[model samples]
Target: MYAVPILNVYDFEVKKDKETSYKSATEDYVNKTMGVEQGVLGLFAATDERDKTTSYIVEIYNDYLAFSNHTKNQASKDFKAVIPQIAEGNLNSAEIDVQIAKDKKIEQNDNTFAVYTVIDVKPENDKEFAEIIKNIVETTFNEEGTLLVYLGTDRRNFNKWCLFEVYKDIDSYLNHRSAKYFKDYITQTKDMIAGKKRAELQVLKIENKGGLDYKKL
Candidate 1:
């Protein structure tokens, strides 16, 4: 017998307001609703201090159909209700149908860079604080040196925000981080936060790019 594949659903927010407050609220909603939903495996979100205006959610499903059924649940409905009032119009969703990498074939690639960041939440006036962080990130990511900057939120753990940054190569990314903008952003956003943030910026070794065929599994 084959096990069902898990599905991940992530909803993003990219507006210009309610940064910190949105993070807290969104985390709470996902934990109470989707985390407890039947067949859900894992869920989480990541907020970027550089861009308070942007946010994302990461979801994992037990199987394709379990993920399909998740969309129609009542808990999902209740969570959706808050999007309009909180996110405004800057919102997008992504689904990463991931399967376990059996034969770890990742090889050394010279052109790819991935930066993972984690930020701590501020205690007071968090809504405003997140907005500030969002502006900082958005400005940096918009620069020519950047490739793709994504903010991920957790469907299960709301308080943890994941920041994923992809760049063409090492030089451009290093240059971008060294720019005056990041310095200013760090100085400004650091005060409103008390939690610890961890970052892993690494060069991805690309083996053969491939996908898992669940039906064949």
Candidate 2:
């Protein structure tokens, strides 16, 4: 069996007045320390487009050793200390399993964009739902400029799924959405999905450490 990277999902409400402060501080630290960190496979942060107040972040580590090193970094500690004052509440955390991760990515560009989506699948339909997604993953490999696509399931609930997709541009991403497999994914999964929320993300950072690649089950 192939190894999978540890994935963490964090969400927190940013105080309306402190949103700019939060993003600027976070982005500044990320710009300097993120891509350089050893064993830190990937990290991305974005605010919800609905109100732009909720901050969502994803972190992937090659193992616990990498995770521990990052956790103990002084800058991260500083960021940790400051979050509580600017956040309406402590950030909520969840562990997720990477079902399919395509991390060999294209360079970021002026038109690069990202979309983060949370999906709720009916437990009864999970089997069929997953197969469709697997097909979607294979089809995505054919799309140029698709950048990164990560599909994961929340450990707390197997039926809860999340997808983070980065594209070289909006046009290619739109092209992805228009693909036959994706269209079929929607068509077949329409009834199996209980709910879903798609958030357009102003991704502050993304890193691929020769990544975990894909997880074959």
Candidate 3:
């Protein structure tokens, strides 16, 4: 059984005038390999809203073994070759365990508002933080217009956590923050969090995104 969930999250800043080339390479990989690949779940890539050159990509896979194979695919190798020439600085790559994953598998990506949030949890509050996370997942799953919500923790470090949220559109995403449970979550978890950062991504529409189910054949 493919029971393990692995999230490969990466963030990088593109070199001057390299946005077009970088995305070209990205889309090519998405369509040629990840799009049709069975073990791969998603290929969500986006440039930062604040700085257009900053890009964040999240690849969801069924298992660690399957995720390992993705790196060796032809499309992956092709994208890797172009990255060094077009990207500036280091890429923040993380392998995290999927604690919660809920997907609506919406048909269109246009106008969808997505946010990638990284949280640094205090070491002393692991249990407390986990409880808050459990609540967030349960509460957010029932929220309307909430397309997808994926949460993960660093495999090597329990203190590092990341949450990926997708909404039907900007309007619903804005509405999520005002939610009563969300506000209470923030208020309750404030003391257990050491730091947090958010990156906004407006996803690009692609034909194939393996979203039906990852654990079943």
Per-candidate TM equals: 0.44, 0.89, 0.90
Where model 2 places Cα greater than 4 Å from the true spot, the runs are: 210-212
Q: Give candidate 3's whole-model lDDT.
A: 0.76
Residue-level lDDT tens digits of model 3 in 122-208 = 999988888788668657767888888888788778799888878888988777888888888889899999999987776753322
| Backbone clashes in model 3 | 0
Could you give the candidate ranking by TM-score, starting with the highest? 3, 2, 1
Give the poorly placed runs of model 1, Cα more than 4 Å off: 1-108, 156-159, 201-217
**What lDDT, from 0 to 1, does candidate 1 have?**
0.52
The digit string of per-residue lDDT tens for model 1 on 18-93 reads 6656766666655665445776544445454453444555455556676676777765676677666678565655
Model 2: what TM-score? Answer: 0.89
- Which digits, one per residue and each the tens of the lDDT, describe model 2 over residues 36-149? 677777777767747547878787787777788888886578778888877997579878888887766445556878888889999999998887886687578558877777
In candidate 3, stretches whose alpha carbon ends up further than 4 angstroms from where it belongs are 49-52, 205-217
Question: Cα RMSD (Å) per model?
Answer: 16.2, 2.1, 2.7
> To one decimal, what is the Cα RMSD in angstroms of model 1 from the true structure?
16.2
Candidate 1: residue 200 Cα off by (Å): 2.5
Residue-pair clashes per candidate, as listed?
A: 32, 0, 0
